[PDB]
Unconditional design. Structure first.
Ligand code: NAG
Lengths: 49, 44
């Protein structure tokens, strides 16, 4: 049931080895988890802000 | 779904006094609990 590719450098596009990665999210029941990064903004003083 | 633990280690039947305990962990587990046990270090 198992075969193997080849991949000699002298192949055309459509037969050279491509690397594929996939991300998949799922939010089961957690209150909070890994989120995006936070954009700061310095911090000034003695001013109504 | 949050399992909180407060703790404090104060050096000296229990005595008599007041001491407030501070948060130790914050654990977003989701686990349900209805029973528990303890673990002890035996003499061998
Ligand atoms: C904990 O058990 C109750 C039933 O006693 C159930 O309704 C609830 O969904 C359970 N919580 C979790 C996080 O599985």
């Amino acid at each position: 049931p198992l075969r193997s590719y080849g991949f000699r450098p002298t192949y055309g596009v459509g037969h050279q080895p491509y690397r594929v990665v996939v991300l998949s999210f799922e939010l089961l029941h957690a209150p909070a988890t890994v989120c995006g990064p936070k954009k700061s903004t310095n911090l000034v003083k003695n001013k109504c802000v | 779904g949050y399992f909180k633990i407060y703790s404090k280690h104060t050096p000296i039947d229990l005595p008599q006094g007041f001491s407030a305990l501070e948060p130790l962990v914050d654990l977003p587990i989701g686990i349900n609990i209805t029973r528990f046990q303890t673990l002890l270090a035996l003499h061998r």
